[PDB]
Design an enzyme around this catalytic site. Structure first.
Site, mmCIF file in Angstrom:
data_model
loop_
_atom_site.group_PDB
_atom_site.id
_atom_site.type_symbol
_atom_site.label_atom_id
_atom_site.label_comp_id
_atom_site.label_asym_id
_atom_site.label_seq_id
_atom_site.Cartn_x
_atom_site.Cartn_y
_atom_site.Cartn_z
ATOM 1 N N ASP B 62 0.846 -1.187 0.000
ATOM 2 C CA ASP B 62 0.000 0.000 0.000
ATOM 3 C C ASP B 62 0.880 1.236 0.000
ATOM 4 O OD1 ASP B 62 -1.948 1.935 0.226
ATOM 5 O OD2 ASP B 62 -2.074 1.747 2.398
ATOM 6 N N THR B 95 -4.079 3.555 -5.153
ATOM 7 C CA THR B 95 -2.867 4.069 -4.537
ATOM 8 C C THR B 95 -1.676 3.253 -4.972
ATOM 9 O OG1 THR B 95 -3.652 2.813 -2.639
ATOM 10 C CG2 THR B 95 -3.760 5.212 -2.515
ATOM 11 N N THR B 96 -1.901 1.967 -5.251
ATOM 12 C CA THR B 96 -0.914 1.142 -5.924
ATOM 13 C C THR B 96 -0.298 1.850 -7.125
ATOM 14 O OG1 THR B 96 -0.594 -1.031 -6.951
ATOM 15 C CG2 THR B 96 -2.676 0.084 -7.337
ATOM 16 N N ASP B 393 -8.414 -2.466 3.455
ATOM 17 C CA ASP B 393 -8.667 -1.749 2.215
ATOM 18 C C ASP B 393 -9.751 -2.427 1.393
ATOM 19 O OD1 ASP B 393 -6.600 0.058 2.902
ATOM 20 O OD2 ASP B 393 -5.116 -1.373 2.147
#
Lengths: 49, 527, 518, 518, 49, 120, 206, 49
Positions: B62, B95-96, B393
């Site tokens: 993450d 976000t990766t 997540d």
């Protein structure tokens, strides 16, 4: 700041407030910004110029 | 005349960089962060390990965590850092690659700057390109509103969202783990869900597969008294705040004993009070009690004396998790508790989860319960920690899906169509925003290249073919054969993603880079 | 597919690219009719102004290795062309910028070079096509070439006067026939502080910075010149010698006889009829005697000591007068003659020797620089020197191209379609390769302060049928026929630039690592 | 208890083993990238020399200029230097090959077998290999067609590793012709290698005759045809004297006056002695005084002074003239004769051309190009490329490269690994396996999947196709005889032998001890 | 306006020379347009302060 | 990227040079015209020097900034050329510098400035 | 260009791999010597605690007491501590096993195969092994004679690595009786361990 | 270091020079000891060799 907290600004009066002036006469310029900012806002930008 | 003068103190150590040189400098910094993150995306991506100042470590994929752990000194980097933090709690993974979107755009943005092109228009066109992207994107967006009870679109989406994480070992299970978890706690009447209703619980030990969601609540507390029996079948439950001691009015209060009988009655009362509430709970007909606060060792045994196990020193949030999961209430008084307020559940049993440790308590409630917990077991502390965040997540996107039931097959197909959709406009663009178009479109192209590079295949030989098919065909469902499966139909490959995820993502990115383009000058204080 | 384990090289590559781009962009400001000269202060404390990038770079104390090669690269371009040292590096870096572009585009660097090897082959072909063959005798086109080079530096102030000075000088030293590669060192430069750049002068003759040794002889008419190497003093052998005194008459006999020896010495010189004396350094041993000067001045003969062994060929190349190292050889047969020669008086008292008119016209020539700023004089000659170089470059090839970036945009345009023709990933490289050339015209409009993208694309759009003659005009600030603007440069200039860059970046790609050494 | 002075070390047989291996592994992996037809090249920079830096591909120089403290590594660095003075390239190979020995040998340390055995079996394993290699060599004697045919094949193999690789065909002829000009003489000094900036790499070549980087004297003929040449070492500017140092003591200046004159006559007649040879060209490594030169100019005879012994060797070689002294018997001394001498200008300098030379024995290669390091490393490339080339003449036997032959050795040991049975057989495996790693590394830097290819290449050789090799322009197995991928047997022999010894020494040690540095 | 054209990178003088000249008689509220890079009635363009 | 020093570009140095020039003007602006008042320099150890002529004044004055030396260099040539105008000449140039930069100080192209300056 | 604060690091995929890998190998080879029925043991000493020291064969304790900088190694230490919580010994085996897993994995990196693939095969390779491992399991339910007979056998196997090995028989009965005391209760806290100097090790008893 | 199966040493000179050898005297010769009796052994072997 020297503290490391960054601060972006487009309003120069804000920028000037960040810009800790040591020259005296210039501080007057800085004061004007506050007045105009306390009055009308951007163009404080212009006000300096 | 010419002679030194002071405008700002420490004028010597007030350095200042202005204009294009500063501009590119930030771009140079930006690319580093981009190149820092490129490897972190996708099932073939590889995750990073951070080392804490107090010497601790953390391995993760993450990027939000990665940057949150990251200690930069360049200010724009921190903007990127919080940027990802802003995206994560906004949506989650993606976000990766979220920052990777920004900088490559910035990298090429400088190419326009190298063409002397003024940032203001560059700010202008990309935003227009951004609006172009979304209205194209949602047009070609699929929906899971059209779906029946959404059991396994979500499972696929969970399956998708977990392929980026090392917990992919048994991720199918965890995909099921979350979807059950979310559906239980969801308010379809609201399109929202509070993550507080979810109790993450990961205790090291056992295999990853030993990770097990619990339709109930688990307690990191053992029995109040060791002789109290470990299992309890019936679940007549008492939920208490008032600790089992003499009540003491918290206004400054004190008694002033004088005579013998003064001593005795209080001494007499001292036990008499305990029997009272001991009677009181007994008359309530509960089977099990639980207290937030302390016990007296005496009445504890007396409470054990009537086969009514209780729990002492229970943390706040959980108690209500107990209460709501039981449907139960919280009474501060002995007298005012009645059986109606009592909690009920399917099963409660302490677990000697550790081979060599003190134990845990679980409540296998059997009715409906708007709160729930997940129990994680596995071999490493950080592995637990990675799972939690990864698991944490995965919840959000389904929550995110709850807000919007329209998604797109992921795998890089989505934006690919956009740049093509962007590019088609670029011919009807007219001027210099015309350059601005292909620039961002060219900027957008990186993400698949990130994939295939992390796939080890030729990035360009891939996407060039990928475009042409999505050029030759009209189906926007052809991404990257990430796991080496000769089918580009990611729709059949089921690699899918919510509309908003990308939608907020790039839209978020645009505004940031707008500010990124917006600044020219910096005055850095000397350290 | 295959997996790449190491990234140390790739990042190391990127480091070089970032350096190079930073370097070229720094130089980018100075180029073309709107080039802007720069200044450096030495750590030793020296100060320099410069508009030519090579001299900038030879001033550059670069730490990073890569541009040091780029610095070296220009020196060859300077050893080749003289300007475009300006242009070439910005080409070089721009290539790496796109070379960067392809790097995250994942293409292995090796193929890039061969693609570039192909890319260059088209261009050098194209440039041959577009150039204009021109015989050397057309003075004005040489002049047209000249100011085209010259309106790039400060010397543009007196360009209109400076350009003829240059070309005429070339004509006088060259053979307009063999079309060979005549050296410039046969041209002398005279850095004389003071004066006006307007007052910079050509000398169809000889000028020596040194000063006379005669007090009384100042100007000479119909001078018969003599250059002498053997010293005129007390005869001192190469090996150890000494007069021994043990007797009476030794004193005056010695005393008288040295003068007699000196006397006959001068006597023969006058017997030869020469009237102007040239004396080299004899630092190993005695020089001209004071006494002989007394005689020579008594014989009323112009005299100069301290002539550098290095200049002597040039001077006899200039004056056409073989020197003398033994008396018997000293003969009027070798005695050079000049119509007039004397020492001019400038700088208030910065006095200088002049020799105008020679019965034997040497091919060589000298050049006078006057002007106020000491640094400006040095920069002026740099501009003057390169002005000579490009002419010599033009002497190498009787083919002409317009300056002002038009060849480049043609090329990239021409590359644009040929890249379209070529399939494979090489097309992108060439696609990128052409996009590299795109920079220079953009730089012009930058230094022109004009909208580069609008202009250069329009420059492309016109040039789709607005071939090499047309281009961006500086004076009008638009796009026009540069040939009609008489802004023209020899073919080889960009050729050398294009060629030189190509090999280097290929060498650039092959780099994978730098190892710190002892 | 403390034994040595402070700052002295004693590492015993685990720490000693590891650190020796660690740096060795560092040595290998630092340099693996540089060999292979698709290899890279490294950049070396001075700590402080105004950045005296060298991009380099040859590991030896890479090894030469790296300062390493691991003494075992310093062994290897010197080890290659010997090989470098042996064959030049393959320093690339030898060092990295020896490393995998060490890396793999360490694995058997984990296997915990007494290294004394490891020495024995590999020594045995080596014995089979070199014989196995010897069984694979190929001769070509009077077969000038195939000989010269293969001769160029050898070059490109060596050459298709350096930056010049894009022009292999070109320099192939260069080295070929030059090497053939050696007429079986091996003295590389017979070839000068002149480098100067300017021109593309392709523009570099070898003159049909000879060139010199010196200055003509006074206005002697610049061009000479059907030249008579003389070479001497007898000093003129250093006037010939009598070493002991007699004084000259005289009562009267007349006596010294005539003596100065007498020296002049002594000098003058010496020249006329020279002239009696009827020679219009004379040269000397000495600096020559200008007065005799005037006599030479008086002869209208051109001469050059002060060209050092090495060129003098070259001149005598190219012209057959005998550098001489005192010239007493013209008939007993053979002059040098050439068709033409002329002055030709290159880049910036006029160079001294010798056209129509008597002997092709000596030669000199023009180097035009881009960078000092480019020119430098291009220089570095050829000198080695000639270096193999002469030994190829010295020993006209060949072996096919491209890793195949090395595989043949490994396979041979693979067989003898079985005839071993014992602990040594494991080392036999180790030794053979290490060799197979080399071509794998080559396939590595070529970016093709090594794993299958070596396995397949092992198959065909295990089948018996000793000529099947490796493709470097497409990445597969192939017929080297068709593809001419060949090299000197002696090269790879020293390759094998030296590494074998290198392996021996590195293992045999079991304690390093460092004295306190001064 | 001069700062504007700088921050717009425009030939403010020619604009100014146009500016003052057109501001001799032709209309009060003519002024700088960024996108058209020249004079316009900013008032009818609703550039209102 | 250079060791042992940074660089300044554009307005910064542009303005900086103007300050250098103007200073030198202000150095001598009081020593001119039939009312000129002479200058004097305590050297370092009391060997003082009263003088009103700038070329001597400039020559005797330590300078570090480049362009100032240029004016310092410039005057001496005029001293080598005239003798006075030392009353005037340097004041002329920097003022000619002063207003010239001011045009540049907005945007004005310097070479454009030069040509008219040449024309002037 | 510098990005972080001073004293902050960034090692990418060769340096990251390299330093990580050596530490694991160092960790393994630090612990390999202690396992085996003929296994040895080390001494761990406090820097200063009046030299609070423990000669030890059980590596987790050894792992517990070592201060390590390599976080991947520090990862490994966490790994064993879990294992010690579960089975106590075999931490020994786990520790070295993973390192040699790593050491060989580096050779695949030397063989230069993408780690992602390296992950995939091992995960699959793990999957079958446990399956086969399970298929190799041998139950013993009510077969108390064999069970108890096997029960003691497991201890001695576990016991025949620590210093009690010269008296493996003795403690074999000790714990066996001790464990049989638990009547299925898994709470080891029911067993007390009094330790006191004096007497031989054999003289220790229940 | 003794015997056919013996294994020898590598010495590092003060000036950074190196040497690998088996000859014990030479081994001791390159050795820089400080203990006195040790030096006796060094010369011992030296005298012996």
């Amino acid at each position: 700041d020297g503290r490391g907290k960054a601060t972006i600004s487009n309003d120069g009066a804000t920028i000037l407030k960040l810009l800790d002036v040591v020259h005296p006469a210039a501080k007057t310029l800085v004061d004007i910004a506050k007045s105009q900012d306390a009055e009308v806002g951007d163009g404080t930008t212009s006000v300096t110029l | 005349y010419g002679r030194p003068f002071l405008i700002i103190k420490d004028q010597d150590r007030k350095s200042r960089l202005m204009g294009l040189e500063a501009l590119k400098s930030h771009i140079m910094a930006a690319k580093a962060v981009a190149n820092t993150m490129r490897t972190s995306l996708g099932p073939n991506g590889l995750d990073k390990m951070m080392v804490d100042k107090d010497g601790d470590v953390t391995v993760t994929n993450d990027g939000a965590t990665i940057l949150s752990m990251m200690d930069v000194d360049h200010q724009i980097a921190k903007l990127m850092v919080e940027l990802s933090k802003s995206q994560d709690d906004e949506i989650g993974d993606g976000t990766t690659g979220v920052v990777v979107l920004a900088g490559a755009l910035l990298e090429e943005a400088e190419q326009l700057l190298d063409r002397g092109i003024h940032p203001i228009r560059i700010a202008d066109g990309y935003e227009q390109a951004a609006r172009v992207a979304i209205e194209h994107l949602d047009k070609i967006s699929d929906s899971v509103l059209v779906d029946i009870k959404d059991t396994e679109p979500l499972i696929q989406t969970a399956k998708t969202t977990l392929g980026s994480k090392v917990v992919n070992s048994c991720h199918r299970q965890m995909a099921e783990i979350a979807v059950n978890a979310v559906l239980t706690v969801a308010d379809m009447e609201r399109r929202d869900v509070d993550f507080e209703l979810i109790k993450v619980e990961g205790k090291v030990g056992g295999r990853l597969e030993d990770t097990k969601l619990i339709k109930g609540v688990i307690v990191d507390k053992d029995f109040s008294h060791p002789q109290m029996p470990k299992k309890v079948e019936d679940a007549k439950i008492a939920i208490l705040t008032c600790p089992f001691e003499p009540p003491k009015p918290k206004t400054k209060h004190k008694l002033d004993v004088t005579s013998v009988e003064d001593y005795k009655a209080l001494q007499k009362y001292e036990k008499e009070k305990f029997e009272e509430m001991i009677q009181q709970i007994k008359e309530t007909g509960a089977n099990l009690a639980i207290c937030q606060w302390g016990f007296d060792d005496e009445a504890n045994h007396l409470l054990l004396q009537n086969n009514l196990p209780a729990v002492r020193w229970v943390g706040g949030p959980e108690i209500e998790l107990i209460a709501i999961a039981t449907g139960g209430r919280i009474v501060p008084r002995f007298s005012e508790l009645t059986a109606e307020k009592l909690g009920f559940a399917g099963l409660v049993q302490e677990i000697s989860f550790g081979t060599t440790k003190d134990k845990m308590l679980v409540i296998e409630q059997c009715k409906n319960s708007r709160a729930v917990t997940i129990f994680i077991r596995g071999g490493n502390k950080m592995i637990i920690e990675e799972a939690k965040r990864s698991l944490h997540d995965a919840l959000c996107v389904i929550r995110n899906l709850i807000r919007d039931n329209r998604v797109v097959y992921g795998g890089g197909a989505a934006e690919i169509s956009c740049a093509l959709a962007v590019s088609q406009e670029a011919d009807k663009c007219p001027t210099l925003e015309q350059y601005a178009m292909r620039a961002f479109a060219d900027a957008l192209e990186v993400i698949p290249m990130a994939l295939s590079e992390n796939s080890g295949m030729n990035p360009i030989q891939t996407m060039t073919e990928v475009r042409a098919r999505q050029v030759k065909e009209m189906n926007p469902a052809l991404g990257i054969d990430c796991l080496h499966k000769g089918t580009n139909d990611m729709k059949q490959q089921h690699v899918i993603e919510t509309l908003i995820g990308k939608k907020q993502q790039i839209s978020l990115a645009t505004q940031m880079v707008r500010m990124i383009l917006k600044i020219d000058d910096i005055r850095k204080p000397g350290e | 597919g295959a997996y790449q384990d190491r990234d140390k090289p790739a990042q190391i590559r990127f480091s070089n690219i970032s350096a190079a781009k930073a370097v070229a962009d720094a130089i980018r400001t100075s180029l073309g009719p709107k080039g802007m000269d720069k200044m450096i202060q030495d750590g030793k404390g020296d100060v320099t102004i410069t508009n030519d990038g090579a001299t900038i770079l030879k001033q550059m104390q670069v730490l990073h290795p890569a541009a040091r090669m780029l610095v070296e690269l220009s020196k060859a371009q300077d050893i080749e062309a003289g300007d475009g040292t300006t242009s070439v590096v910005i080409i070089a870096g721009s290539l790496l910028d796109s070379c960067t572009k392809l790097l995250q585009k994942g293409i292995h660097p090796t193929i890039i070079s061969e693609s570039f090897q192909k890319a260059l082959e088209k261009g050098i072909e194209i440039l041959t096509d577009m150039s204009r063959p021109v015989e050397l005798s057309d003075r004005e086109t040489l002049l047209n070439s000249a100011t085209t080079s010259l309106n790039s530096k400060v010397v543009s102030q007196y360009s209109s006067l400076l350009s003829p000075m240059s070309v005429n000088a070339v004509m006088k030293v060259i053979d307009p026939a063999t079309a060979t590669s005549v050296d410039l060192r046969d041209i002398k430069i005279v850095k004389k502080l003071g004066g006006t750049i307007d007052d910079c002068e050509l000398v169809e003759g000889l000028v020596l910075t040194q000063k006379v040794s005669n007090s009384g002889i100042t100007r000479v008419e119909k001078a018969k010149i003599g250059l002498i190497q053997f010293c005129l003093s007390a005869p001192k052998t190469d090996m150890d010698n000494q007069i021994v005194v043990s007797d009476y008459a030794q004193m005056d006999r010695v005393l008288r006889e040295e003068r007699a020896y000196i006397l006959n010495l001068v006597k023969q010189i006058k017997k030869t009829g020469c009237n102007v004396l040239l004396i080299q350094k004899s630092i190993l041993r005695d020089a001209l005697s004071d006494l002989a000067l007394h005689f020579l001045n008594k014989m009323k003969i112009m005299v100069i000591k301290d002539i550098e062994r290095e200049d002597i060929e040039f001077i006899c190349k200039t004056i056409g007068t073989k020197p003398v190292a033994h008396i018997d050889q000293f003969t009027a047969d070798m005695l050079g003659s000049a119509e007039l020669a004397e020492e001019v008086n400038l700088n208030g008292s910065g006095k200088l020797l002049k020799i105008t008119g020679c019965a034997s016209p040497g091919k060589t020539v000298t050049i006078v620089v006057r002007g106020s700023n000491k640094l400006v004089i040095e920069e002026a000659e740099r501009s003057i020197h390169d002005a000579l170089c490009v002419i010599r470059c033009l002497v190498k090839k009787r083919a002409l191209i317009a300056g002002g970036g038009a060849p480049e945009i043609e090329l990239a345009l021409r590359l644009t379609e040929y890249s379209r023709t070529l399939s494979g990933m090489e097309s992108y490289c060439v696609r990128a390769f052409a996009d590299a050339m795109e920079v220079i015209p953009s730089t012009l409009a930058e230094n022109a302060g004009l909208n580069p993208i609008s202009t250069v694309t329009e420059l492309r759009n016109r040039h789709a049928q607005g071939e090499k003659t047309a281009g961006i005009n500086v004076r009008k600030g638009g796009i026009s026929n540069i040939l009609e603007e008489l802004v023209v440069q020899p073919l080889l200039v960009s050729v050398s630039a294009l060629t030189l860059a190509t090999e280097t970046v290929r060498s650039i790609l092959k780099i994978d690592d730098v190892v710190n050494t002892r | 208890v403390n034994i040595f002075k402070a700052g002295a070390d004693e590492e015993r047989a685990e720490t000693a083993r590891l650190t020796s291996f660690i740096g060795a592994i560092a040595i290998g992996d630092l340099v693996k990238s540089t060999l292979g037809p698709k290899g890279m090249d490294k950049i070396l920079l001075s700590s402080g020399r105004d950045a005296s830096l060298m991009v380099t591909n040859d590991g030896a120089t890479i090894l030469k200029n790296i300062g390493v403290d691991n003494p075992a590594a310093k062994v290897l660095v010197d080890m290659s230097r010997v090989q470098d003075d042996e064959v030049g390239d393959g320093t690339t190979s030898v060092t990295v090959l020896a490393a995998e020995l060490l890396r793999e040998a360490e694995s058997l340390i984990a296997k915990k077998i007494h290294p004394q055995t490891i020495i024995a079996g590999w020594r045995e394993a080596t014995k089979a290999a070199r014989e196995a290699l010897l069984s694979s060599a190929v001769d070509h004697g009077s077969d000038e067609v195939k000989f010269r045919q293969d001769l160029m094949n050898i070059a490109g193999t060596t050459l298709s590793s350096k930056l010049l690789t894009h022009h292999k065909d070109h320099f192939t002829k260069l080295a070929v012709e030059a090497v053939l000009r050696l007429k079986g003489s091996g003295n590389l000094e017979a070839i000068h290698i002149i480098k100067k900036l300017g021109g593309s790499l392709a523009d570099s070549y070898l003159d049909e005759g000879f060139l010199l980087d010196k200055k003509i004297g006074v206005n002697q003929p610049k061009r000479i045809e059907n030249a008579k040449i003389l070479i001497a070492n007898t000093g003129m500017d250093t006037d010939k004297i009598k070493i002991f140092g007699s004084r000259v003591r005289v009562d009267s200046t007349a006596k010294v006056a005539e003596i100065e004159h007498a020296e002049k006559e002594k000098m003058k007649e010496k020249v006329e002695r020279i002239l009696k040879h009827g020679i219009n060209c004379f040269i000397n490594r000495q600096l020559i005084y200008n007065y005799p030169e005037q006599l030479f100019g008086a002869a209208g005879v051109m001469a050059i002074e002060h060209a050092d012994f090495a060129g003098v060797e070259r001149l005598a070689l190219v012209t057959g003239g005998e550098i001489a002294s005192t010239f007493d018997h013209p008939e007993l001394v053979k002059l040098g004769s050439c068709k033409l001498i002329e002055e030709v200008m290159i880049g910036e300098d006029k160079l001294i051309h010798f056209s129509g030379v008597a002997l092709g024995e000596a030669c000199t290669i023009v180097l035009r190009g881009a960078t000092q390091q480019i020119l430098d490393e291009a220089e570095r490339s050829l000198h080695d490329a000639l270096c193999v080339l002469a030994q190829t003449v010295k020993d006209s036997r060949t072996v096919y490269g491209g890793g195949c032959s090395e595989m043949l050795m490994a396979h041979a040991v693979t067989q003898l690994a079985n005839r071993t049975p014992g602990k040594e057989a494991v080392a036999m495996e180790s030794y053979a396996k290490a060799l197979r790693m080399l071509p794998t590394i080559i396939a590595d830097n070529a970016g093709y999947d090594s794993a299958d290819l070596v396995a397949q290449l092992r198959a065909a050789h295990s089948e018996g196709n000793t000529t099947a090799g490796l493709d470097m322009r497409e990445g597969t197995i192939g017929d080297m005889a068709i593809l001419g991928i060949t090299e000197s047997f002696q090269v790879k022999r020293q390759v094998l032998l030296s590494a074998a010894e290198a392996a021996e020494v590195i293992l045999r040690v079991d304690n390093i001890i460092k004295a306190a540095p001064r | 306006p001069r700062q504007l054209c700088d921050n717009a990178g425009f030939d403010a003088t020619n604009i100014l020379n146009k500016l003052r000249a057109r501001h001799a008689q032709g209309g009060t509220w003519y002024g700088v347009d960024i996108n058209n890079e020249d004079i316009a009635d900013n008032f009818e363009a609703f550039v209102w302060e | 990227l250079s060791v042992f020093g940074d660089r300044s570009t554009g307005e910064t140095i542009r303005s900086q040079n103007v300050m250098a020039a103007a200073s030198i003007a202000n150095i001598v602006k009081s020593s001119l015209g039939p009312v000129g008042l002479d200058k004097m320099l305590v050297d370092d150890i009391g060997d003082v020097t009263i003088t009103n002529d700038g070329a001597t004044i400039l020559k005797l004055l330590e300078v570090e900034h480049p362009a100032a030396k240029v004016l310092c260099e410039l005057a001496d040539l005029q001293d080598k050329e005239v003798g006075d105008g030392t009353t005037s000449v340097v004041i002329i140039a920097a003022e000619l510098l002063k207003n010239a930069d001011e045009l540049v100080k907005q945007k004005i192209h310097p070479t454009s400035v030069i040509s008219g300056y040449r024309l002037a």
